[PDB]
Amino acid sequence: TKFPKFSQALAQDPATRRIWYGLATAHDFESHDGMTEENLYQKIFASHFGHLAIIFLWTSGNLFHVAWQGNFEQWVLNPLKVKPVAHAIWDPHFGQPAVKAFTKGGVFYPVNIATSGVYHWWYTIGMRTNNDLYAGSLFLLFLSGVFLFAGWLHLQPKFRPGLSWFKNNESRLNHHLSGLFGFSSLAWAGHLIHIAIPEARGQHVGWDNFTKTLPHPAGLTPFFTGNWSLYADNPDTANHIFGTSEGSGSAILTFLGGFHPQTQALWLTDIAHHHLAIGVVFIFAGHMYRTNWGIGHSLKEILDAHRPPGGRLGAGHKGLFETITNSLHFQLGLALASIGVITSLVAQHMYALPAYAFIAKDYTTQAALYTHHQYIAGFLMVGAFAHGAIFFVRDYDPEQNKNNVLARMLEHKEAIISHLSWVSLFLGFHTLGLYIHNDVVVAFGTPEKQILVEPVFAQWIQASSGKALYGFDVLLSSSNSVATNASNNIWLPGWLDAINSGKNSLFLPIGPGDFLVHHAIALGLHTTALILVKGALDARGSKLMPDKKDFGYSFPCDGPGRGGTCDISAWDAFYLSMFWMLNTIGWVTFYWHWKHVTIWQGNAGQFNESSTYIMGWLRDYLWLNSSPLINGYNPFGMNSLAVWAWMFLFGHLIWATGFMFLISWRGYWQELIETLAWAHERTPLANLVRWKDKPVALSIVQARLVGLIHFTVGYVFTYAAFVIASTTGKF
Amino acid sequence: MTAAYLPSILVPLIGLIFPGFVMGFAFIYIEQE
C-alpha cells in the first residue's frame, strides 16, 4: 500500500493499524523514512506558513460572519442591552419551535449568540460598521493567500532555506524582539492613537481620513520638542460616553490607571501608552545579540561563561547552546511552557483588568473566555513537558552535557521526584482532610467546628496593592507610605478607585473557602508536575526498564516480566498527567465560575459559607446552577438552551465512552473481532464482500489515546455547556 | 439570486457532498497499491 508513504513498516501492514498509525504519525517528521535535517526544517517552515494561513482564514471567517449575519451595527448603539449574534443557523433538522426559540437576536432568523467577545474587542478597536469588518475579512483572506504562497515558495529549490539559516539564533532573536514584538506593539499604539481613540470619541478616521486628521491638536511638535507631557493633558472626563464626543478629551497617551467609568474597562490612552512603551523596550531588547556587525552578544559565549565559581552547578550552562539549537524538542518545550504561562496570565489579567468596553457586563462571555484560556494553558503545559520528555529520549547527548545543569537534573532526578511526591501527598492529605472535617461537622450540625483558615497572606498582598477592606495598612493601603507617596500623582488615585470598589473583579475579596480551593489547586499543579517530571526524567531509563531510550518515547510496554510493565513509557506519563491536568483546570474553573456567579447575583455569602465543604460545591454550585441547563428542553417545551442541554448530555456520553477504552484492554477485543471475522467469512451473501485490510483490534497505545481523547472531549464539552448555559440562564 | 440563498445552497454541499467525496477519494487512496 502507499498511504503511509513515510513508513514502509506501515505501508506493508495487512491490517487497519496501517491506516490508524498513518493518521497518528503523519506529523512526526523525524521518524519518517529517509528524513534529513534540511528537509525536516524546511517542511516545518512550510507547515508554519500553512498554519498561519489557517489562523488568518479562521479570523477572517469570524469577521465575515459577524458582518453578514451579525447585529454589530445595532449592537454598537446599546451594547449593554443587545446580545451579540455570532452567525446564523441553517439546520434542516430544526422544528418551528426551535427556529422561533433561536430567533432571539431581533434578526428574524435563527442565530447563535457569540460568547467570544469579538464584538466588544472590535468595538474597542474602532470598528463601527459592517463594512469595516468586511474589509478586515478581505485583508485577512489576502494575508492567508500571501502566507500560503510564501509557504509554497520556500519549498522551491532556489528558495528553500538552509540549516545555517535555520540555526541562526541571534538574527532571529533580534528580529523577533525588535520587529515582531517591539515594532508590532509600536504599530498597535499607532493604531490606537490614530483610529481607536478618535473612534471612541466619535470622530471617524480611516484610510480616507487618517492622512488629514491629526491624532492630537499639537500634532507631532510635542514629540519632536521633548514636551511629551502635552500628550497626557486633558484626558477623557469621567462622564465620557464611549463612541461619542460627549465628555471626551484630547490626550493620546496617559497613565490614569484604573477603569473608565462607563465602559468599566482600562483607558484606551493607557493602553496606547502601554503598547508604545513596551514597543520601545522590545526594540531596545532586539539589539542585544550579534549579527552582521561587531556589536552585540553571542548566546554561546554567555551560556558558557555563566558558571558559578562555587561549583554548585558543575559546568554551569556549557553545551546547552548546542543542545538547544540542535534539539527542536527542547525549543518546542520551552515555547509551549512559556505560551502556557502567558495564556494563564491572559486569563487572569483579562478578568481582573478588562480591556474591552462593556465586556465585564457580559457574564457568559467572561466565563467562556476564562475557561477557554485556562484549558488552553493546561494543554500547552502538558505539551511542554511531553516534548521535554521527547527531547530526553531522542535529542539528549550525555557526552555533550557532561556535568552541566541538565546532566545534574538527571543525576538527582530521584531526589526531585521523591520530594515532588512528598509535597503532593502533603497537600492532598491535608487539604482533603480539612474538607472532610468541615463536611462531617457541618453534617452533624456544628459548622462552628469547621477549620476555616483566613488567607492572610493573599489578603496582605491585596492590601499592599491598596485594598483597605482588610485592616493591614502596609504599602498602598497606608497613606503615609513611600510606595503611596511615590505614585500618588501618576496612577494611584485611579488604581485605588478601581481596587476599593466592589463593582469590579479586581482583587476580589477572599476567605477560607478561597484558601482551601487554592491549596487544592496547589495539589493539582504539583501532582501534574509530578507525573510529567517523572515521565521526563525516567524517559531514558528506570530500574525496571533500564534501556528505555532504545525503545523510544511511546512504546506499549515491556511485557508481564519483572512484575508487569504496563504504562512504563513517557507517553504514558503524558497520558496520565492529562487526566490530572483536566482535573486541576476543572477545579480552577469551578472556583472561578462559582465565585463570579455568586458575586454577580450579589449573594457572595453563599460562596463564602458553602465553599468550605464539598457538599456545598455539589449542591449550591452544580445542582443549583444546572437547573436552567437541564430545563433547556423538557416535556413542556424548549428554549434556546436546548442546544447546550443536548451538548451537556453529549459530553457525558463521550466521557463514559472513553471509559471503555481506558478500562477494557486489547486481548478481549481481539478475541471478539476474530469471531466477527469468522462470522463474516462464513455468512452467505455477505462473503461476496471482503475486507482489504484485515480487521484487527486497536493497539494498546492507540486505545489509550482514543480513550483519552473521548474523556477530554466529554470533559470540555460538558463544562462548556454547563458554564455557558448556566450563566445565560441565570443572567 | 441573493445571499440569503447561500446557506441553503451550501450547507448541504459542505455537510453531505464534500464529506462524501472526501471519504470516497480517501478510501481509494488509503486502499490502493
Binding site: 507547515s47 494561513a53 468586511y134 483572506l141 493567500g145 509554497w152 519549498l155 | -
Partner: peptide
C-alpha cells in the same frame, strides 16, 4: 448591509486562497 457583490469578492479571494492551499499541500506532500 453586506451586498452580494461584496460576498462574491470574498468568495473569489477564498477560491484564490484555496488554490494556493492546494499548491502548498502538494509541495508539502512531496
Amino acid at each position: 448591509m453586506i451586498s452580494d457583490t461584496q460576498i462574491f469578492v470574498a468568495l473569489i479571494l477564498a477560491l484564490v486562497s484555496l488554490v494556493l492551499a492546494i499548491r502548498l499541500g502538494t509541495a508539502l506532500y512531496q
